[PDB]
Design a protein around this ligand. Structure first.
Ligand SMILES: [Zn+2]
Ligand SMILES: [Zn+2]
Ligand SMILES: [Zn+2]
Ligand SMILES: [Zn+2]
Ligand SMILES: [Zn+2]
Ligand SMILES: [Zn+2]
Lengths: 224, 223, 224, 223, 223, 223
């Protein structure tokens, strides 16, 4: 089942509860939270108290993407604030295996994020720790950027790795993609092998979230 | 005039526009923004896009307190997002004078923040750059903490320094205090020499912001 | 009462329990622990597990001097390992007041350390948090260095500040000095106003700790 | 020959010379030193002066594992303090080749350490600099943790790489493993291709080091 | 077409314009600038104002190698100072793809640098961003060091990767090598697959730059 | 005796030896070197190899101002490269007293630099270590900026402190000022208590260095 994860980075921060409720009413499967500390990326967004404040409105799981360094303290705070999934960048933790283990020990699904330049081999020794891999199709920091075409090849490479792992372990690790996903390209991203699609500006930047998500669903029906 | 500056760190982040509108309806003079980057303090709060989103609701000035390091990039982005006042901690900038000058060059009032341990003498060479001094009466990072009594002596010391500076320059630098300010202690903070009072939990943690701010106003009349 | 605090930085690390027992038998009032993380100073010494291992041998209080940055995690670990006093350098903590409060909340006496260049004014806003002030008479990092003569004036300045504070609060904050203290200069350090004296090479570098400490006591009787 | 390298991280720091002498009497081939600076890992252990103090007791080589960042200053000081082998984490040095060269230029055998997540390919361009590769089977920082099963696959991968390198160069690079090694799993670690085994809690946490090391030797005979 | 890129790190800094003019008169194809910030490498060299001052003398392109961290501010200032090519180390930028894009958006050719230990796979996801790959044959920081023999294998590996990419895209990415290149080894570097050769001490440390460059050209004609 | 110290930050880096020779011919007493590592200040200038290259041209002492962090490695390399005076910022060294001692132990005169915001009290515990105090009259990083008027008060404060120290010790510590010094303001800087004057753009940005320095001398004779 394909999952659509609207990114609140593009929402109206003066009415965040309404924005979350409205995108859930439109069919969102996850609420995607882009957490930036002004150090790992050149922008500062929102911390765990924002996650806690939205927990009563989030009848679907909250997916926290940590663009912060280091990561372990915010892993704990976001878990306590109600996150369901936490992902972080391997470059941002000296002890990646420990950080992934901590996410699961805090009760959350765990994942790693690949920047455009980050090789996929960074995943090969932590597959048993992973519930999801997020591939960035833009350079992290900002919404509204354009999908980097080479990401399709990386998605195919990750999918092949995860297909082989599922054959050995029986576990399916999810593939999420974040960056410039639009109705007009979502089918290509799914065809490359992804199953979870983060979109900010394409949804929140439009007047009718129901129409956008339905149009994305119709394109995904073509990829299937 | 005394200014009351409710701190949105204690507000409902799911309904921030309503919270800002309601505290302005209750008599807020400024909206206080506690910006934390998880490096200068052990907490992460909210960035310039939150300031920009609240600008249409803020009919009073936005007062941005940067608990971040370094500071110059966020000075620029908060100014562009509609901040009216920007303050930062001297320990967080290698070039304090440059950072204060940048705030004014971006169109904003500029200030420095003193942590509880920070000596007042860090202000003495930048008075011409300052519009406000913020004294922390708690260790920055968290709301709901208790006012540190020694802060009253520091407020008196800063007020004496700024009184002397006004005698020389004719310009009055404002004094703000942040940390554990409540109705039952606000008069003492004013008597020590402060004029702008940040309060988070005492306002946003209560059901009627109008009642709290009016009660603070009544205590300030005694100061 | 004057306190002598032998510094284990100069002891035989292959027989640390014996060294602690022997210096206590010689009249030590405190065991001084110089903790260095290779970042705040250009040397690496010993961590909290060494403190824990010596706790059964330390029938006198353990005085931990943190030459580390940042400080709060090691404050907690050294307190849990049995430290009685913890001091740190104000330059090494972004939130000095918080760090001093944490030391006391962990059940320990709290202090700040002044490097040779550090002005005394850094103490003026945390006197209610302080149980001790340590003045370095050498640049931290190494034993066996020579006492910097200007330290005497700084000790006098701190003593005057603490005398005035005691007049207002009734609390006496202790003054410790660390760096090149020897039998031949300890009386001058006491005359300047200090009450607690750290010595490493002058004690542990000699064959008879009883003789050294007794000679220090005799010189301190002259300062009194 | 298989080498057993007891880790003093788990020893009695009040009687370190006795501990070293006793584990050597029990058959230790190396004394393993876990050096932590509270920055590369969230723990602080012991510096070069502890190595120097143990040198007169160490009739077998001292194997220093640097969990520190940066590494070059401590490479030099541990070499001067009597280390025989020095290993460090590639992530902790901007110039890995330079750091490995420095270890050998100081008279020591040189190695790299792989954290559980670290890919083996980080070794492929420095084989001529290496005397040993250490694979962590736990996340570095603490003794007493449990062996991560995936480490066996990584050991096999490293052994295959080093077998190919020996075919080309004629030189055998040793493989060390550190983390949760016990009598009941040491044979599996050897079968995967390792030859040097670090153990802390399994040896120093037991009353008779001779019995533990002999029992490990008996299991290695089955490998 | 082979390019020789004399490295001004080895030139007379009191007469830099003459040095640049003289090496161009000798046949230089590029002027190589080794920029060091004392943080990414343990040396400090020269900043963008030096590039700007040499722009009037550089009738051939200026090739800036950034051994600095972070990189984006200096990418911009070197581009504005007249650089034609800018390369940096992937380890020095958190967002490698962004930094490479910025170089091209500033009007320059973009490249990545591989330290001796750095795996070639760090290039595989940014080939569309690259105009050049620089392989260090010494540990960066200093001139006058000796060529690391394993570099030849890495050059071959990069050339195979770039050959496959040229077949897919039609774009040829250049391969530069820097570190201990001399007349007596330049042919072997070319045979391994490189096309651009940085040399400092071999050129500037000799009295006749024309003779050295001619001798290098003659060895390359044999390659 | 007033000293004029032209700052090569404003010189023609393509002809640095000629620039140094020409400013010495014009009456320079020192050659001022503004060393920036892109970390302590947002600019990168020139390292010790540039100092070494100018040593044969510098018949007057070289005065190195380190705007770098940390400082001790560059203290050593600039001393070895021929510096006569080395100054650094107290905020840039964890162990200020050690760093000042190192400068003298390397054979150089030692000093501290005060940024515009830096309090003078940072000097009070190292007077025995100091040969010079430099007060910045601009925020460090760039030439061509405007003199900050409050610097005059700081100069007066430092001169009073140093006067008292000279009475106690018999040692006169020099006072240098750097930032926007021009012929039209140099007398006021001297009257405030300074004796050594760094000027970049006012000298090197003009066609006749002899005329500028002579004009500065004439204003100083009126001071
Ligand atoms: Zn995201
Ligand atoms: Zn605040
Ligand atoms: Zn100490
Ligand atoms: Zn180890
Ligand atoms: Zn280069
Ligand atoms: Zn200067």
């Amino acid at each position: 089942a394909y999952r659509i994860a609207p990114s609140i980075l593009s929402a109206d921060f003066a009415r965040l509860g309404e924005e979350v409720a409205n995108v859930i009413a439109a069919g969102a499967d996850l609420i995607h939270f882009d957490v930036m500390d002004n150090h790992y990326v050149p922008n500062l967004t929102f911390g765990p108290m924002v996650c806690a404040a939205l927990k009563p409105y989030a009848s679907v799981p909250i997916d926290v993407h940590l663009m912060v360094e280091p990561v372990d303290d915010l892993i704990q705070s976001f878990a306590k604030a109600g996150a369901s999934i936490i992902t972080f960048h391997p470059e941002a933790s000296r002890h990646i295996d420990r950080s992934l283990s901590l996410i699961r020990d805090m009760g959350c699904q765990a994942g790693l994020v690949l920047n455009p330049a980050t090789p996929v081999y960074v995943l090969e020794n932590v597959l048993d720790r992973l519930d999801m891999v997020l591939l960035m199709s833009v350079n992290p920091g900002f919404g509204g950027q354009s999908f980097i075409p080479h990401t399709l090849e990386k998605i195919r490479q990750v999918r092949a790795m995860l297909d082989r792992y599922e054959g050995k372990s029986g576990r399916r690790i999810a593939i999420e993609v974040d960056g410039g996903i639009k109705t007009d390209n979502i089918a290509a991203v799914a065809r490359a092998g992804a199953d979870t699609f983060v979109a900010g500006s394409a949804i929140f930047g439009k007047p009718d979230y129901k129409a956008v998500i339905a149009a994305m669903r119709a394109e995904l029906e073509k990829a299937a």
